Design a protein around this nucleic acid. Structure first.
Ligand SMILES: Nc1ncnc2c1ncn2[C@H]1C[C@H](O)[C@@H](COP(=O)(O)OP(=O)(O)OP(=O)(O)O)O1
Ligand SMILES: [Ca+2]
Ligand SMILES: [Mg+2]
Length: 430
DNA sequence: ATTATGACGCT
DNA sequence: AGCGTCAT
């Protein structure tokens, strides 16, 4: 009853860029705007692999993780922009730099957690308290929420999508108690007003559109964001959770899309998030462990406590390349040349990071895959990173992996390497 | 031959 | 520490 926490203490948003690498390429090349188009890396094998797709192209069934030659079968007029290649490998610098543009704008409004190259969480609790005072019990006009959906509405006693959006928004606003400055629903609404402003700023200052979710925690904000993509934002209230979750496949919730989520389904014999409410906390802990069990017990009631971490910069800087099929590295000379290529890109990015962000990496992680293994990594080894020097780093990497060579002859490499990976970690202020 | 990343959990 | 899981 009165002592039952409802997880309505925070206002959290998740902002996610729409079709992000495609928008980056469309800004640069106006010929790609408002077209079925995709971003591809490499080209020789099956036309290259698609890693981002415009919404126009998605209408034809084009997806990421598709080969371009196959995409062209669905969409013959598909336009393609290629990822830059430097030192023999795909280079994602353009997209990392575009990411920084958006992250710096978001940071003006609140402290953010960089969740990926194109999305960030925002804790708006304090900003909302501030704006609520400015408002002075003034109602919130629908005009302040021009791209907002209220999940679950309209309900009860309609043909167009925009028309439906406004119907739901009006029902929501009509029901709002603006008198209470601690009403969670009001707090979410003001949060949504701020996120409209944030999203307008991002589009004005970069040209990029995005979607967003507004709720009381990160998991609901993420879920909300996807409900109305692209170029829209969605408010998921605490009250909307029972209906929303009653038909929500468990795999849709962040962290449940893999083996754990499959185990929840199998062990408990359920399909939807809402069905979890029928188990005790101890029951869930017994199957999924203490931490997961407690997290699931709260999450299926719309409650989660994971903080938005104040972290705008990535914690690691890494460089990776696959050498598939026939291209696997089978000579020592090959291995050394590619370690150098990776190390040179790594040095470049590290030197820029040190200048921009006043920090230095202190640990180098070296990872490889050997032909045969189905795991991402076959072997991961760390060594000290004491100088930002590519030749030193590549020599050090070679030293820590050279023992994996089963070949009796040492100019040859067996089994051949199908992946190299260099990663800089353990930053210290500088 | 679904590539190039990046965070966090386990033991 | 090195490995695994999950994610974009
Ligand atoms: N598996 C991947 N491999 C390589 N790059 C990826 C992968 N997934 C995502 N990316 C890149 C390309 C995407 O444009 C960018 C952001 O990913 P993501 O948010 O999942 O999709 P998106 O921004 O392209 O479309 P959406 O509008 O659905 O968000 O990160
Ligand atoms: Ca996105
Ligand atoms: Mg994203």
């Amino acid at each position: 009853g009165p002592h039952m926490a409802t997880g309505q203490d925070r206002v959290v948003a998740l902002v996610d860029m729409d079709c992000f690498f495609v928008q980056v390429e469309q800004r640069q090349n106006p010929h790609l705007r408002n077209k079925p188009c995709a971003v591809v890396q490499y080209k020789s094998w099956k036309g290259g692999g698609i890693i981002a797709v415009s919404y126009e192209a998605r209408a034809f069934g084009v997806t990421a993780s598709m080969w371009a030659d196959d995409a062209k079968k669905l969409c013959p007029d598909l336009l393609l922009a290629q990822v830059r290649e430097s030192r023999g490998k795909a280079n994602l610098t353009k997209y990392r730099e575009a990411s920084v543009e958006v992250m710096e704008i978001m940071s003006r409004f609140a402290v953010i957690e960089r969740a990926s190259i194109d999305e960030a969480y925002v804790d708006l609790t304090s900003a909302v308290q501030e704006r609520l005072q400015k408002l002075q019990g003034q109602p919130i006009s629908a005009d302040l929420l021009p791209s907002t959906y209220i999940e679950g509405l309209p309900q009860g006693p309609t043909v167009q999508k925009e028309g439906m959006r406004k119907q739901g928004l009006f029902q929501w606003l009509d029901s709002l108690q603006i008198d209470n400055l601690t009403s969670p629903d009001l707090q979410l609404t003001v949060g949504a007003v701020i996120v409209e402003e944030m999203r307008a700023a991002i589009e004005r200052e970069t040209g990029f559109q995005c979607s967003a979710g507004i709720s009381h925690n990160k998991v609901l904000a993420k879920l909300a964001c996807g409900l109305n993509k692209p170029n829209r934002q969605t408010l998921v209230s605490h009250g909307s959770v029972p209906q929303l979750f009653s038909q929500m496949p468990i795999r849709k919730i962040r962290s449940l899309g893999g083996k754990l989520g499959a185990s929840v389904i199998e062990i408990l014999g359920i399909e939807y998030m809402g069905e979890l409410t029928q188990f005790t906390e101890s029951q869930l802990q017994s199957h999924f462990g203490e931490k997961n069990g407690s997290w699931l017990y709260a999450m299926c009631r719309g409650i989660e406590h994971d903080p938005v971490k104040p972290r705008q910069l990535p914690k690691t800087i890494g460089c990776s390349k696959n050498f598939p099929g026939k291209t696997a590295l089978a000579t020592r000379e090959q291995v050394q040349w590619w370690l150098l290529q990776l190390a040179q890109e790594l040095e470049e990015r590290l030197t820029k990071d040190r200048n921009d962000n006043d920090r230095v990496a202190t640990q180098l992680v070296v990872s490889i895959r050997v032909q045969g293994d189905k795991r991402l990594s076959s072997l991961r080894r760390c060594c000290a990173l004491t100088r930002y020097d590519a030749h030193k780093m590549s020599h050090d990497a070679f030293t820590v992996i050279k023992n994996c060579n089963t070949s009796g002859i040492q100019t040859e490499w067996s089994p051949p390497l199908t992946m190299l990976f260099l990663c800089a970690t353990k930053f210290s202020a500088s």
